[PDB]
Amino acid sequence: LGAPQNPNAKAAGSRKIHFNWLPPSGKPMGYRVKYWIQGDSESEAHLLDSKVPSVELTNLYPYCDYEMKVCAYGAQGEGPYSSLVSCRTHQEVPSEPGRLAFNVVSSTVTQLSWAEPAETNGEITAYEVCYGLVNDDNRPIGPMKKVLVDNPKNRMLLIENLRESQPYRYTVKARNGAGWGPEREAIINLATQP
């Protein structure tokens, strides 16, 4: 019942990683792989029955640390578990930002406020706000006015000098190392608003 030395594991996609290791010597009919999130229990891990010295893990959380280990069972049974490997999955496009909440100041001035994306998938580096004129059918009138937020820390944005009683479209997107993400959009007319 030899132990499988020299394993190396890397990422293969944004939601899957690849575990390989050099075979031992003895009587392994099939393999078993223990794998869990770095910071989680040892016994509470996911186990995946393999017959070949290689696996492709799935439903892994992007930008999350993983630990794993593989044993070998056969004509005698399970042997020793290999050296513990540690792999972190790739980043991914963040989700839509939080609810678009306004704070009405004047008929031409507002205070835009959103929450950080539901699932970050990495570290959000920046956001983007775009606003502009619109009709009743969500069909913009003219170009959007995209304003790159400076740092991801601030979710507050002030907006002044606007047409009164005119509906506006606002959009917010999230950028993380993997790139941009789906947007959150709100149509708001400061007249109807409190």
Binding site: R99, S113, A115, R155, M156
Partner: protein, 225 residues
């Protein structure tokens, strides 16, 4: 924005004060609350009651964690408008600030009681009446709003001196700067009245000081009297 930061500061120092019994402390209001564990501690202390806590780390866990805090407020008849579990657990600052204000309004501005009440007035008006009534006999002093009235800090030194004249020399606060009035009042209120320095003078000596931050400090000034 920079306009908002002063209120963010004041709420943070307020929450921290009541926290320390629960030996945790906030460094940033918009992040350290998202998990709800700090929120529940604030309610566990401000009422004495014992509230439950999930211990998971999934979004569902913090979402279910914070809903417990909101429900103890809902069950206590407190009116929460436009605030969702989806709102706080990700830290939408305005709605986080909004919640913390609600808590301050419920727990520290409800049992306001002054002579000559009309039992219709809001909590604010009562404290605004209480403010006016204390500074009643002082000269050249009116307290008409929780904004531009307190800029000089003269109102602060009166509310103190009315209580305890052994600590304020009123003639001096009339002549010296708005800062000197603010700082001396704040130090006096801490060393001798046991109130916490929720406001820094620099934040107050501006044209339109944050009303909400003012109301919070005068509320902290009423507990001690």
């Amino acid at each position: 924005d920079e306009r908002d930061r002063v209120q963010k500061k004041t709420f943070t120092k307020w929450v921290n004060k009541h926290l320390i019994k629960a030996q945790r402390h906030i460094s940033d209001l918009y992040e350290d609350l998202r998990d709800g564990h700090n929120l529940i501690s604030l309610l566990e202390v401000l009422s004495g009651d014992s509230l439950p806590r999930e211990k998971g780390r999934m979004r569902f866990h913090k979402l279910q964690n914070v809903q417990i805090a909101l429900d103890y407020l809902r069950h206590r008849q407190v009116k929460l408008v436009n605030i969702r579990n989806d709102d706080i657990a990700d830290g939408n600052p305005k709605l986080t600030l909004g919640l913390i204000w609600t808590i301050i309004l419920h727990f520290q501005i409800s049992d306001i009681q002054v002579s000559g009440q009309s039992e219709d007035m809001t909590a604010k008006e009562k404290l605004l009446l209480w403010s006016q009534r204390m500074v009643e006999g002082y000269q050249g002093l009116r307290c008409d709003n929780f904004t531009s009235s307190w800029r000089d800090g003269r109102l602060f030194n009166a509310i103190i001196h009315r209580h305890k004249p052994l600590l304020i020399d009123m003639n001096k606060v009339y002549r010296q700067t708005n800062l000197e009035n603010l700082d001396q009042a704040f130090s006096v209120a801490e060393r001798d009245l046991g109130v916490t320095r929720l406001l820094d003078p620099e934040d107050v000596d501006v044209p339109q000081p944050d009303e909400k931050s003012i109301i919070t400090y005068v509320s902290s000034l009423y507990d001690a009297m």
